[PDB]
């Protein structure tokens, strides 16, 4: 786990991601249901990042996966979407922030990455999913 | 390269060897239900003989029951001139009460004719008998746990001249940490006296009479099942819901522990429930704890609210049999059977219980099984939600239906957050005295 | 197939499956795949239920044949309040393979015995055990000191109606179908019938057999009788039952209550193991007697 | 179960959903077959909601899933399609309304959500399937 | 569940699973599904490991219950150098089902015994055998001519510290954890303890039991001792072991080396099969003697 | 089973459906075949109905599934394609009509329906399959 | 088996079909492998017929499947592609014609058909696969 | 225990279950706490006898005995049962790994050193199923088990 | 592998599987994966057949190894009229693992015995039972009152050619390969050979063994002989058979027909169970005799 950097600045339009829950459920077949939640929290689970710049940006991006990545390190993630609460219901969010200001430490959900060449200097990679391990 | 048809081979071993790691029998399985696999149990010993080898195991028993014993330290034949020995027959382990009514090969010998010295086999470590001063004190064995009976200057004249097979009535009180707390008669009495006296006679009211001759021996079922788990090492054992008298059960050494206990689960029918880590042994009744309607079951795996299986008519055990021990007279293997009047055409299913019980009780038990095994044809396979998870694994469900409202005791609860149940049909009226006359 | 081979050797064939089960009661039920109600015998096969007909198996060995026969339960059909109460147990089937164009072109695949019926989710699934179900079971007597036969049996014929033995009286006070009050308790001994046949011949439980216990008359000939098991169908406090008398299956209860001690079919004396290995000691009683 | 709010007002064209019936069925291979249902109601089973507004609406929408949501709470649902009956047959609907005026309390059929960024201010999420648990 | 039914009958529930295992050593370990460290007893359940909680099964039969309980091994956790050496064998668990909002709303699903642990690929999988594991095993004595008990046992109490019997000396020369040099060999007989308990109470192998063999002192009281098996944790040539003396479990070795020949719990004479079927010939020795 | 109404009048272009048979078949591997028919009839098996009108038509259509539907009732079906015979071969159809004039009583082949909103007043649902239970 | 008629005349562009050979095969993992066929003929196996005419043609086409069809009858099939031999190799075809002049009696490879309505008079059905059973 | 392999952890192949070494430790409730024989006396009058070996820590249960019909002396029988009670507790651990055909000369009965980061525990192997990827069900075997027990006689 | 480790430790390897089976007849067959015909011994391995080589298994236990070895049957190959008739039964294989670049770099994976061969769909599938197939079978004699050995056996050596005992004559009239006319019937007794070896050494069934029964000569020395079983290959009414004489395996038929009553290897008298538990009554015959 690191505190190394946010990310390369570029993120394409389509960087999707939202919180998860396990919340297993029985669906009582002759009436309503009853369902349990063991979390009290949520994995933010950001997906579908895309790097799109010159090939000068690519070699600092492929080794972003490699050098400080490996598999098992932080690389605090920037959200385009210390405790934050959500007060728009009379309920509350009250979800903690271990890192400062929406920085949500994560890890990539990939055994490999796949960078493509689109033109003499175009570097693309279609997806880098994350799940924000604590 | 590809794989062969040892894909069937790796499906068995150890593909199915992992299962029974983590897990006549014709009537044994139905009485435990879906339940679990009924282990082979209680091939009853007829012609009790004493083998003097070194590979026979130490027996154990609870109450008035004959046991064969075996020879340990017999001296050489001594000719008076027409023979004499000095036997020592070791019956069973633990502190026992006294051994009376010895009968050898054949009918009966009077114990007053013998010179036997009985021993309790006390953990107090009884000293040497001094008849083993034939051997001398320096090599005299001094058996701690086992309860041996020596025999002194035994004339081999009336029974041939060979050694006869001796068999001994033994009374053994149930021991163990749960037994010393809550004392029953065998030490609870603390002086009864009141011998009626006032002298072929009037024994027709002995089964209903206040006096306690004979039946003072019989241990309560609570402590004997506590003795099993105590010897197995489970001291967390919970047994306050048991109500039975044992009267001379006997399992041998290396009888699996549980297979000795499983004969009692056929006789008195109790749950062996284990709600919590206490392993509650409660007596089985029809007392309904659930009251589910049909609207209150969960969505199962097979997407049926209640799968109801009715077993085959060709296998209903039309007539049931036992192999109990006589327990009043000369202890001998006997048999009673219960025959259902409509379908007597076949399906004999018998089993053998090695305990000792009386005559009206045996016809009561087989009358109970023949009713239960035909009641326990119906099994239900439903899933109930974890909103009511307090249905323990041995409880019984009312289970209101549009057509029937038939009770169900449950087995094989597998939950993972969705309690899925293999029940079995159980009625309340099965568990009653049959009220039969005696012999 | 029996001389439909002319129909069958042509690729153009039309054999639609169909079967009839005869219940333990005298009524039969009809089932067919043909989707139109058809009959050849007086059975009136209905395609409203039954009939998935999955994979009849065979074997030269004594092991049974099997067919799970998935279907539907309905008010015209089995209806499952009939099935749960104790009917359809030894139900005998014949599966047929009729030509629906001409039902005189048919045969029997097997005649079965319908062992295991699993009903659920608004449907039923009923394993059709083969012809050889009875083989594979234990039948025998074990020399036990009781009797061995039932009252109606050939080994002990009784003429069970020969006097005022049977209690023919109509029922009242059915309660939870185990207790039965019975208005006409009076007419017999207390605890007369303790192992008898409670054949109920009217109403809901029609021709249904239970076994009695606890024949006790509390006041003015009430005769409150328990049973071992539920009847499975509730009697309606107006049904007629008849109860044959109770046999304890013992020599004393045989000859005293009943006259038929001749037809005993039991083994009263049966000396024992300890007698067998006993050698005769020349002491005490060694004269000829009962050994009892 | 809550009574908190309807929803964000925006719903895209394509918000699908209609009643779901157990309809346990036997399918006799002969021909005609019988069937029965144990509900006597119908789970309305609305799907395919889409939030589309500015990013100011997104942070009150992502914590709508989180704060009063979790998994197991009401958030009464607005239908663009006290007892209502349906009299267009000679049979009847006679279906109850526990909440007032078509408000059908539900829950989302998702372990996670997935909000996307499509431009400097565009917030999108493709689906939020519900089932109106009683 | 024990009076959380008010919490549980509502569909809004929040019961997060959690369990504690107590090792054979006095320490316990904590495990929870809740993803936040919580405690109710002094256990401090950690969500850093353990906890997949797959499908606890049940049965009225004596057969055990089971739960495979997939998880993770780490330095705070089991760490698998602890597990492989011989710990966690008879580890006792309780699984709980706590409310994480209020941990006073909990019960026990079962109390287990954790039989089979399969670790691999950086994780562990540990079958939780049920409460009834001890049933299903053979326990008995077979009248064999040795003894039958261990030294500390109730059937042969010894007071194993009563004199200079135990060898308390600290260890040197551990080599391959089977050979042990032992600086303080001198103080006892050669080959004094041949079946003893090598309890090692310091360092890496803390409270770990092995069995001795080949108690030989080579020069100046070295006392090189082998063991049957590896300890599984390497002692560090500074640990303290104590070795209880060796019992050959024989009458001669009982009474000579030890005083406790009274508490024998063994069967020395035990004549034999050929004695039993023998009839007494009237030739040679037929006077009363040892038969040995 | 009802005799309630035909249907809403609207049906989109693409309402597909044609008769079925089981007619199980062995395909004798070294020559020709032989095959059996247990029906003597055919399930007409109409599929792919689409309602397309205003939202005023939708509430009389969603409860068409619900009110007289449930699952297990008739709602006689109108075919855009008393015994009718087919004489264009020298064989014959001779297929019965329990209802009058091509009205083929059916049931919907759905546990749920799925009505969509396409515009302020557009109501669409893509499919309602039927099989014509007797 | 019939001799009833060819078919409706119309067949759309795309009526595919060609001979099907058992070709039992061993595929030795070494290399070359042997094979044999037990037919000495070839099932012609025509597929993808399409009827496209007015709705007047449809009712004589839907009962073509039903009346003389059922499942198990001939309806001799017209090929747009008495013994015919093929002499373009020095081998020979020598394949028989039980029916006259390319008429190849078949059966449809369908439990059901699916006729669609595409406009006031348009009748379409996408496929009727046959296999020319002898 | 003569080791023929000397594998490091880096030198195993990719198995089926995608674990380099699956290591199974058997249940404590079934470890055979006391073992028994039924040998024949072989010096005196040939009679069935029995010796047992009891592990001092866990004597609480799991009696596991077998019967051998051969004839052998008194110190040898206590030597054999002393060997089984040590071996059956050693052979609790089994390993299930796959090793590449680059070293296929590991015959089906050889024993592997198997260096790990934590332990370096030997393993004798069984049930080799290769097809071009030797996959192994090993079992834990120590060298010191196979020695004379050096006991006194009768 | 035997010193191809230098070839094998490199990742660049090229070991192509190949095996030879030796039939019960002297010919061998060759099989390889290499797709080019190669040989190292005089076997000429052909890739035209055989060789899928699926998953040889092993075990320290006595249980066999197995390999199903999918392949193809053809006229050069096994051809399955050879296989069905009774050849390839105890066929012995060696599987090899040769380098096709250099066939001197090879070893044996196992030497098998090819137990179960399942042929179908124009292919064959042949389970290669391991080296330990013979273990796992019952071998013994049960003291029965017949003989126990075959004629050629070491326990009864006979010199089966020593006189005019064998019938060497060439065959005519093969009919359905059970009846055999035999032109030269005359030369021997009627019913001389009733349990003999019909070794046929020419033509189709080359070296194939059947057993005779019903040695009857009908007219002018025809000697029509049946067999128990079909030969599996039709003899062509010109083949040469030789038939060794028939042994009834009985003491009377031993010493009369054959001289070799010394080498009996049988148990004629063998008194019985009822003799064993009998006590000697002092009545009737109690003098020394045959007890027969
Ligand atoms: S007592 Fe008599 S009537 Fe009754 S069963 Fe026995 S023999 Fe039959
Ligand atoms: S020799 Fe004595 S101390 Fe040692 S085990 Fe035997 S009885 Fe116990
Ligand atoms: S009869 Fe003679 S030759 Fe024939 S098998 Fe017997 S011993 Fe051998």
Numbering used by the authors:
A (entry chain A), D (entry chain B), F (entry chain A), G (entry chain B): 2 to 82, 157 to 209
B (entry chain D): 2 to 24, 38 to 95, 112 to 229, 745 to 984
C (entry chain C), E (entry chain C), I (entry chain C): 4 to 295
H (entry chain D): 831 to 984
Reproduce the article's own wording on this structure.
Gene transfer agents (GTAs) are DNA-containing phage-like particles produced by some species of bacteria and archaea. The genes encoding proteins that form Rhodobacter capsulatus GTA particles (RcGTA) are derived from phage DNA, which has been integrated into the bacterial genome. Here, we use cryo-electron microscopy (cryo-EM) to determine the structures of RcGTA before and after DNA ejection, and to visualize the interactions of RcGTA with R. capsulatus cells. Particles of RcGTA have heads with a diameter of 38-nm and 49-nm long tails.
The structure of the RcGTA baseplate with imposed threefold symmetry has been determined to a resolution of 4.0 Å. The core of the RcGTA baseplate, formed by the hub (Rcc01696, g13) and multi-domain protein designated megatron (Rcc01698, g15) proteins, is decorated with tail fibers. The hub protein can be divided into attachment (residues 1-142), ion-binding, oligosaccharide-binding (168–249), and clip domains (264–296). The structure of the megatron protein is composed of iris/penetration (residues 1–46), adhesin-like (47–229), peripheral (230–744), central (745–984), and fiber-binding (985–1304) domains. The iris/penetration domain of the megatron protein contains α-helix 1 (residues 7–16), an extended loop, disordered region (22–37), and α-helix 2 (38–46). Helices α1 from three megatron proteins form an iris-like constriction that blocks the central channel of the RcGTA tail. Attachment of the RcGTA baseplate to the tail is enabled by the binding of the attachment domain of the hub protein and central domain of the megatron protein to the N-terminal Ala2, long loops, and C-terminal Arg209 of the distal tail proteins. The mismatch between the six-fold symmetry of the tail and threefold symmetry of the baseplate is resolved by the different conformations of residues from the long loops of odd and even subunits of distal tail proteins, which enable them to interact with hub and megatron proteins, respectively. The trimers of hub and megatron proteins form a compact complex with a buried surface area of the interaction interface of 3550 Å2. The native baseplate of RcGTA does not contain the space necessary to shift the α-helices 1 away from the pore.
